[PDB]
Design a protein around this ligand. Structure first.
Ligand SMILES: CC(C)S(=O)(=O)NC[C@H](C)c1ccc(-c2ccc([C@@H](C)CNS(=O)(=O)C(C)C)cc2)cc1
Ligand SMILES: C=C(C)[C@H]1CN[C@H](C(=O)O)[C@H]1CC(=O)O
Ligand SMILES: C=C(C)[C@H]1CN[C@H](C(=O)O)[C@H]1CC(=O)O
Ligand SMILES: C=C(C)[C@H]1CN[C@H](C(=O)O)[C@H]1CC(=O)O
Ligand SMILES: C=C(C)[C@H]1CN[C@H](C(=O)O)[C@H]1CC(=O)O
Lengths: 32, 85, 257, 51, 51, 51, 85, 51, 51
């Protein structure tokens, strides 16, 4: 079966998620 | 400690003969048994074949009750065939 | 055989394997049953699913991280929104694609692999130990065998420690059951089929037979009983008595049969 | 499906012929040696065109 | 079998099925091949995939 | 996973079903051990087939 | 025809010797060549081994220039060993 | 499934594979050490290949 | 697909890099053919390594 648990590889997409949310917070702030 | 197939052959025939001598009148029945004992005593390059196969076949097909001596005397010079197969 | 040669018994009826070494000393009637040297192992457990197999492909860390990521996206949206929805969409896209792909890999791997096919496979792996009885026609066959695979197997078995040989059939089967499938038992196809049909039914036969031979009824050489016994065995064969008998003792009353 | 009955072929010799026992023992030897198996694989399977 | 009983041939080697009727007149060596009565048909060109 | 497996199995009708249908005719050789087996057979299925 | 390991040995030694006789004085050099020719003429159960291997070895290590006759006479009784492998 | 097949290994492993399939023919020189090696070889795989 | 197949990555620093870096110390036996090989070697890289 070879259990994967690929969390390291997915972590990057999690990081680009956090980055997108950060920029989102930035836009939300510059708006208000 | 080499076996030397020629010596093995002479031993084979000798042990078969000496064994069959013990059984009088039943000689044609016990050929295979005595051949087993001979293959055991003289050793074999192939446990299936035995020390000398051609001699065994010759004896089995020739030997009749009480006919032992002449039959063996006729069969002991025969070619043993392939000792490995 | 000893009793027959030395005349302590007039006839021998038993699962006696026909061999050349035995055919030289005794007379074998035509074979009343067919068999062959075969492989017995422990049947793999069908399922132990749990709810954990669903959380297996996606790591626990990924679940925690996606939950916190989820609440983070919610609290970000609570405070523009277009790129949030887009980034979250891309995120969950990569995640569902990864889950699908990984689970696919799991199922593919699980469907791809087979434990054992033939004897040759047993010769090619050191993980699963295997053995035969302490004596009898199977062991002697392996010893006297000049065929490559069987030769290798014999060398391994004789050389391997601790000894792979067992005294009785029930002991070998017991070892098959206790070894969690790390031990394979080489025994004639008949006994294998019989044990495979008896509860707990945790054991099974894999692949074909290594060799093709049969049992037989033995009579002293030059005995009067030989020809009548032989012709009788033939009669029983054609009449189907042997078939019905084997079905009687082996299969028909089989609990797992 | 399976086979209806279980039987076998054989080499036949006149009753009381000298050849009988040698032929028999020969068949046994060839059997354990795998000569029968290898021969059958030779003629049947090896050149088999159907895969 | 006839050739063997009436002595026109010393031995018979062929896919000769061992039967009691044949075993009564002549002698059979131990079977060199195993077989059984089986059924032969035409292989279906395709298999319906189904819903 | 299924598509990666690519396993194909072919079912069979065996012997028992054959006695029960008139759609597919079946036969043996004009003589020999098979015909004789069917002739002398006291088993239900084979008996029916012979008839 | 039929094969005989013993006949093969007795033939082997003789053919080797008879071959080495033409090579007198260079005899120690040609042992293997003559053994090849002898293995060809007398046949062998295994093409690698030859008709009699032990005799060949004995000759190879014993045979000295012009000492042939005594060497062969000493080596011809030697055990051939296993003519399988 | 397709891409799984694409990156899937084991097209060829050993010499034994040539002995196990009749689809791909193979050969050596008309003479020389290779042919003779296969000729005099008593070990299983190479023997089969020579045959 | 790539998850099913996985992969193996094989790095090689080879011989010359050992000559090109002081970070990883390296050595041979106190005696024997290897040490002697490095000693008598007239080849640039091996010479440097021996030095
Ligand atoms: C010991 C070997 C030489 S051998 O077993 O004889 N030959 C090997 C060869 C592959 C073989 C092995 C086994 C059989 C075989 C065939 C049928 C049976 C049973 C079911 C019926 N007995 S019978 O002999 O055919 C009958 C007509 C009474 C039992 C054994 C037929 C052929
Ligand atoms: C069950 C035993 C000890 C017997 C039965 N047949 C084989 C025989 O006839 O020797 C033996 C098993 C075996 O060695 O495979
Ligand atoms: C091929 C033929 C005619 C022979 C071969 N064995 C069977 C036999 O020995 O009788 C016959 C076939 C059959 O009976 O269907
Ligand atoms: C190229 C040829 C014919 C030579 C080279 N080496 C082998 C030799 O020394 O016999 C032969 C090739 C071979 O046998 O595959
Ligand atoms: C183990 C020793 C000292 C021996 C073994 N082979 C080399 C030799 O045969 O000289 C030496 C190893 C070496 O030189 O690295």
């Amino acid at each position: 079966k070879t259990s994967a648990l690929s969390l390291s590889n997915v972590a990057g997409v999690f990081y680009i998620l956090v980055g997108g949310l950060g920029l989102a917070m930035l836009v939300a702030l510059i708006e208000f | 400690g080499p076996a030397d197939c020629c010596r093995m052959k002479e031993c084979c025939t000798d042990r078969v003969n000496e064994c069959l001598q013990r059984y009088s009148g039943r000689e044609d029945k016990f050929v295979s048994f005595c051949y087993q004992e001979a293959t055991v005593t003289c050793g074999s390059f192939n446990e299936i074949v035995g020390c000398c196969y051609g001699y065994q076949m010759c004896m089995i097909r020739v030997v009749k009750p009480n006919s032992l001596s002449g039959a063996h005397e006729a069969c002991k010079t025969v070619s043993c065939g392939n000792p490995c197969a | 055989v000893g009793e027959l040669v030395y005349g302590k018994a007039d006839i021998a009826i038993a699962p006696l394997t026909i061999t050349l070494v035995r055919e030289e000393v005794i007379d074998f009637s035509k074979p009343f049953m067919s068999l062959g040297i075969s492989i017995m192992i422990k049947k793999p457990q069908k399922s132990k699913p749990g709810v954990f197999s669903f959380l297996d492909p996606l790591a626990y860390e990924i679940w925690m991280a996606i939950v916190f990521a989820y609440i983070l996206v919610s609290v970000v949206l609570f405070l523009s929104a277009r790129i949030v929805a887009g980034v979250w969409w891309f995120f969950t896209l990569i995640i569902i694609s990864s889950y699908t792909a990984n689970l696919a890999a799991f199922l593919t791997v699980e469907r791809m692999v087979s434990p054992i096919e033939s004897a040759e496979d047993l010769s090619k792996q050191t993980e699963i130990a295997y053995g035969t009885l302490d004596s009898g026609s199977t062991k002697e066959f392996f010893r006297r065998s000049k065929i490559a695979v069987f030769d290798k197997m014999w060398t391994y078995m004789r050389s391997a420690e601790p000894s792979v040989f067992v005294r009785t059939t029930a002991e070998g089967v017991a070892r098959v059951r206790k070894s969690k499938g790390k031990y394979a038992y080489l025994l004639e196809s008949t006994m294998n089929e019989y044990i495979e049909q008896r509860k707990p039914c945790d054991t099974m036969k894999v692949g074909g037979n290594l060799d093709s031979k049969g049992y037989g009824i033995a009579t002293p050489k030059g005995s009067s009983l030989g020809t009548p016994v032989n012709l009788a065995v033939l009669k029983l064969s054609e009449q189907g008595v042997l078939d019905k008998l084997k079905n009687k003792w082996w299969y028909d009353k089989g609990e797992c049969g």
